[PDB]
Amino acid sequence: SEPQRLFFAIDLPAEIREQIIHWRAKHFPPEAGRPVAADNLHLTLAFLGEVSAEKEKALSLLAGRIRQPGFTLTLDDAGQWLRSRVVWLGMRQPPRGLIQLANMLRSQAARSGCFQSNRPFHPHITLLRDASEAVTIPPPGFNWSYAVTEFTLYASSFARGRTRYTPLKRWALTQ
Ligand SMILES: Nc1ncnc2c1ncn2[C@@H]1O[C@H](COP(=O)(O)OP(=O)(O)OP(=O)(O)O)[C@@H](O)[C@H]1O
Ligand SMILES: [Cl-]
Ligand SMILES: [Cl-]
Ligand SMILES: [Cl-]
Ligand SMILES: [Cl-]
Ligand SMILES: [Mg+2]
């Protein structure tokens, strides 16, 4: 019925999310940029844009065909992209499983008509937006490492000046 704005993502366990926001607060004054709400911290795998109900169902079926092992993420990197004005967390050497999962979902989208940026996948978790000015970036905190067991399809909506993500479907990572 409803045409929705969709994306696939990896989520953060609550403890790591709490560590990230504490570290962010400690190292980045309000002036440095607009903080992403704690609940909204995530790692995007594929952005689908505006998707019809019929297209969403077809993409969800394809997502449900994916078979691959889970993997461990360890966030050992942080940086700023002036181009899109964000400060982010990431990995120096992302696990093969993450790259493969992202490529798979993007490939499924593209083959389904959903335009995908030719820009090489750069997995990241945005912490600050509208960070239009260069700022000092400390290394991430110690031991921000966890097992990824699932990925999730989200819908994105905006009202009241706050963006909300609503989970639609989840899939476990299984061989
Ligand atoms: N054109 C795009 N290409 C790749 N990823 C995108 C694109 N647009 C959005 N995303 C990513 O998909 C996720 C959802 O984005 P969306 O634009 O719906 O909400 P948002 O960026 O959090 O909120 P807002 O755009 O209102 O500030 C975000 O992680 C975003 O960075
Ligand atoms: Cl937010
Ligand atoms: Cl950087
Ligand atoms: Cl981003
Ligand atoms: Cl720096
Ligand atoms: Mg956006």
How would you sum up this structure, described in words?
With 175 residues, this protein is α+β, with helices and mostly antiparallel strands. The protein has one domain: Cyclic phosphodiesterase (Cyclic Phosphodiesterase, Chain: A, Alpha-Beta Complex). Helix content is 23%, strand content 37%. A 4-stranded antiparallel beta sheet has the order 3-1-9-10, covered by helices on one side. It has a 4-stranded antiparallel beta sheet with strand order 2-7-6-5, with no helix packed on it. A hairpin with a 2-residue loop joins strand 9 and strand 10 (162-172). It is globular. It starts with a strand and ends with a strand. One chloride ion binds next to strand 5.
Structure keywords:
175 residues; alpha+beta; Cyclic Phosphodiesterase, Chain: A; 4-stranded antiparallel sheet; 3 helices; 23% helix; globular; binds adenosine-5'-triphosphate; binds chloride ion; binds magnesium ion
Q: What's the structural blueprint in terms of helices and strands?
A:
Layout: E1 4-11, H1 14-27, E2 34-35, E3 42-51, H2 53-63, E4 71-74, E5 77-81, E6 86-90, H3 96-111, E7 124-129, E8 145-148, E9 150-159, E10 162-172
Antiparallel strand pairs: 1-3, 1-9, 2-7, 4-8, 5-6, 6-7, 9-10
The neighbouring-strand order within the major sheet is 3-1-9-10
Bound molecules: adenosine-5'-triphosphate, chloride ion, magnesium ion
Number of structural domains: 1
What is the name of the CATH class?
A: Alpha Beta
Could you give a short account of the major beta sheet? 4 strands, antiparallel
N-C termini distance? 34 Å
| Oligomer class | monomer
Q: What structural class results from the helix and strand content?
A: alpha+beta
What would the CATH topology be?
Answer: Cyclic Phosphodiesterase, Chain: A
Number of helices: 3
Number of beta strands: 10
General shape: globular
